[PDB]
Structure 1
Amino acid sequence: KAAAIGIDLGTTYSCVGVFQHGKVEIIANDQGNRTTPSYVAFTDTERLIGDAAKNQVALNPQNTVFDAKRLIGRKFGDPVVQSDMKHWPFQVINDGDKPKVQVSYKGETKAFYPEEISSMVLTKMKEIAEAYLGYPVTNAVITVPAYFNDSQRQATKDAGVIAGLNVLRIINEPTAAAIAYGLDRTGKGERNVLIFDLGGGTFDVSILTIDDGIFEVKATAGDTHLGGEDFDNRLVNHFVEEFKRKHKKDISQNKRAVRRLRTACERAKRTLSSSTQASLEIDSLFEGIDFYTSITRARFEELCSDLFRSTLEPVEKALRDAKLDKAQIHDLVLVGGSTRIPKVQKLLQDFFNGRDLNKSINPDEAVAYGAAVQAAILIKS
């Protein structure tokens, strides 16, 4: 009676699931949250992981590590690492072409390999599972993007090992997503599946082929820095401009006012996925002025138009690299919280000639769900 877990070690957040009593439970942490930010903060007195780390990122930016997934398994010299560095507030150093994150922790300067940071997020996922199950957990399946190379998969494996996990297998995120939808168990036959993964920060399009239960990646396309946060920026910039046009004051130089507006915008954006309009109500936003306004879905769609239509560019590219016509795609799977946006679903559906989208599994949890299903299948031997 020792169940294995499935972990989606995400760029911005992580999610843990377990197949137990004939179904998957996506496990909530102590706060009741089913996702955990992939953030690790170092203070002068303690190390914080998850929401406590994200909460204070703007307070202690040099010592709050996120995006470790953008560094893991890569060499310091990699053009990807060298470009990502210019926009992170934390220091990235090297130990013979191996990148490391350098921080201040308890009055000491400490350096960590990306797998050491991710092992900290993984230890949190392990504890979360253990609190739920009521017994230790050591066996796990960890997901990775389909585009990761041997070095990136090995370093993810290393992060699991440091966390005291026995990594049963490293599997592709779109593969876990298709497994969550049971697309691997259709039976005798060849099927083409397209995974449309629009996250908080990343956009990934994967085309997989499933034949007699076996998976083959045909194409990986996407945008490494497009996501939910970009739609928030559009809403923020819009309301920074609206406040200025109404009250003739620029709020953008006040950190707290920008932060409070950004929080209200992100919630307004979520409300616009189920309603046609959202209210934005901030007391004493700037110079003591209350900001009470609204935004319609149509207005939000216009502000993000480029970002919305751009999601089809990697869909079109993926079909080309896969040497497939759009009619040859049997199944469409939505992953990532931003796929709840009606226009995102409309653009993709219209493109695939009204084809139904597999969206009944929470898009933030679908990857962990498939990994948990897979972990139970591997351990069943």
Structure 2
Amino acid sequence: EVAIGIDLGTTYSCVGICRNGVVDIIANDQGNRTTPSYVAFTDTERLIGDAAKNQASRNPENTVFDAKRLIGRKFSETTVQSDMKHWPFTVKGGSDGKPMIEVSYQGEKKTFHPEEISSMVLKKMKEVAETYLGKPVKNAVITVPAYFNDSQRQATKDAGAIAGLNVLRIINEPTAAAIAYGLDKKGKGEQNILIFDLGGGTFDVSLLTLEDGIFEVKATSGDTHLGGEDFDNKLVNFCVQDFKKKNGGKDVSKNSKSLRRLRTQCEKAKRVLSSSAQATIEVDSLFDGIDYNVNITRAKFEELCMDQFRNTLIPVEKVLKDAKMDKSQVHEIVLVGGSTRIPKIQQLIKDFFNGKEPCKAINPDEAVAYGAAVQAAILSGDQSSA
């Protein structure tokens, strides 16, 4: 009877519950309101979430992430050929054409389908909700990108069933974000909603229309390889070159462990730069026992990412063109995804929409789970959010 909403994200997942008209986003064991979509296998144990992401640089080969890029795809798809360059783990094609993720677990070679890896993330999110409620949870609404095809959606549903969840429904991520803000029950008249979703690995822009509680996805666009990880890479590339100028041409990029440790600190400094004017990137004994330290101003970060930030407007213009509508016709702009916390991105979107304030009251990396939790409560017969 208890139903949860789960945002099964590319890089982070989130679980919410809507009870008595109110939505609680549930913190995991480490107090984190989102959980990495990571699964790691060691000589002794299977780690999921924070523990898996935390040891990724020490166990790259057996730490799986990005299973959402493989779920419901045939291994031969060109997107798999292209994406696999970014994965330290091995992916091979099975006789059925499905991807098989290969890891070592307790000294043995193991293979998993993408939906098996995703089922472990879903099981962790289910357990996070169960620990909070103190009761077992069986029903869930799980979200997927609006462009996900039938195979990708069915494999996501199968991942839910493997995790022990009764999937009440698979719904679109942009629609879940709009439902979170009560835009389906506000005004009644026709509303054009733009969802601007910039996460860790992907960028999705969706233009929705809503007449009388009915959402329709009119147009979608974006870039499946533009996200926060790309802004971290701009900081990494700068630091690699800065280390060269400081230490007689020494190249950190030759050591993959040095790059991973540098990337971890680049991502931390980036987050700091969303609320501070400066941040320090520091890695003790980075390469050749040399300590690395640099100060990055928000202005320098904005400069390194200038083109990537500005180019987020290209898919915005594309959805408006496809839907045959002017930017002045957009009633609400909803910011979704952890990267929408970057002040420069918020300013670019606001200026594009002629000073219109975007809807960002809900923590952007929680809005999809928040909407899914609302839909899960409605599908369970609870009309309290209405």
2:240 matched to which residue of 1?
Answer: 240
Whole-angstrom CA distance in 1 between matches of 2:197 and 2:57: 27
Matches within 5 A, 1:51-62: 51-62=50-61
For 1:378, the equivalent position in structure 2 comes to 379
Q: Which residue of structure 2 lines up, in the alignment, with residue 65 of structure 1?
A: 64
Give the equivalent residue in structure 1 for 2:13.
14
Contact 1:205–1:314 (Cα < 8 Å) also in 2? yes
| Rounded Cα–Cα distance in structure 2 between residues aligned with 1:105 and 1:313 | 44
Counterpart of 1:366?
367
Contact 1:174–1:206 (CA under 8 A) maintained in structure 2: yes
User: Whole-Å Cα distance in 1 between the matches of residues 45 and 290 of structure 2?
Assistant: 38
Alignment correspondent of 2:270: 269
User: Which residue is equivalent to 1:82?
Assistant: 81
CA RMSD of aligned residues (A): 1.7
CA drift at 1:262: 2.4
Query: 2: CA distance between counterparts of 1:109 and 1:259?
Result: 25
Which moved further from structure 2: 231-240 or 137-146?
231-240
- Identity of paired residues, percent? 75
Q: Within 5 A, what are the aligned runs for 1:289-368? A: 289-368=290-369
Q: What is the CA-CA distance between 1:188 and the residue it aligns to?
A: 2.4
> Which residue identity lines up with residue 92 of structure 1 in the other structure?
K
Alignment-derived partner of residue 180 in structure 2: 180
CA–CA distance in structure 2, aligned partners of residues 105 and 217 of structure 1: 42
| AA matched with 1:171 | I
Alignment check: 8 A CA contact 1:187 1:213 kept: no
Pick closer, same or farther for the CA change 1:280–1:78 going to 2, 3 Å: closer
Give the 3-state SS of the residue equivalent to 2:241 in structure 1: helix
Q: Is the 8 A contact 1:198 1:227 kept in 2?
A: yes
| 1:254 shift after superposition | 4.1
Scaled by the length of structure 1, the TM-score of the pair is: 0.95
Number of residue-to-residue matches in the alignment: 380
Quick check: 2:272–2:279 contact (8 Å CA) kept in 1? yes
Amino acid at match of 2:278: Q
TM-score by length of 2: 0.94
Matched residue of 2:252: which SS?
coil
Paired position in structure 2 for 1:113: 113
Q: Is the 8 A contact 1:193 1:331 kept in 2?
A: yes
Runs of 4+ in 1 over 6 A off after TM superposition: none
After TM superposition, give the deviation of residue 380 of structure 1 in Å: 1.3
Residue range with higher mean Cα deviation, 10-19 or 88-97: 88-97
Alpha-carbon distance between aligned partners in 2 of 1:261 and 1:74, rounded to the nearest angstrom = 32
> What is the rounded CA distance, in whole Å, between the counterparts of 2:126 and 2:169 in structure 1?
16
Does the aligned pair in 2 maintain the 1:276–1:297 contact within 8 Å? yes
Q: Secondary structure at the match of 1:62?
A: helix
Separation in 1, partners of 2:13, 2:327: 32
Q: The residue matched to 2:294 in structure 1 has which SS?
A: strand
Letter in 2 for 1:113: H
Q: What's the secondary structure of 2:195's corresponding residue?
A: strand
Mapped partners of 2:337, 2:255: distance in 1:
31
Q: Structure 1: state its 5+ residue gaps.
A: none
Instruction: Say whether the 8 Å CA contact 2:12–2:36 is kept in structure 1.
Output: yes
